[PDB]
Amino acid sequence: MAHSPPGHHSVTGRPVNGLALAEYVIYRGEQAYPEYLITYQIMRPE
């Protein structure tokens, strides 16, 4: 695992694609807690 940029705790990947939302990177496992486990199927479009 790499380090956060000096003076930072995470990276934000800012979305060319006007509809895309942000992606985030943490470099410490302790900075995330898995609150919910969601079980699902993707649905075939009609």
Partner 1 sequence: GSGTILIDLSPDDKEFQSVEEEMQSTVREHRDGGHAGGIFNRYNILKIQKVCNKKLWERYTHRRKEVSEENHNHANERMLFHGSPFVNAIIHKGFDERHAYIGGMFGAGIYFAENSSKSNQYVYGIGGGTGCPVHKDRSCYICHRQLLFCRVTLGKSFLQFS
Site of interaction with partner 1 (CB under 8 A): 1-2, 4-5, 7-17, 19-45
CB of 18 to partner 1, least distance (A): 11
Longest dimension (CA), the chain: 49
CB 35 within 8 A of CB 29: no
CB of 7 to partner 1, least distance (A): 7
CB 24 within 8 A of CB 13: yes
CB of 6 to partner 1, least distance (A): 9
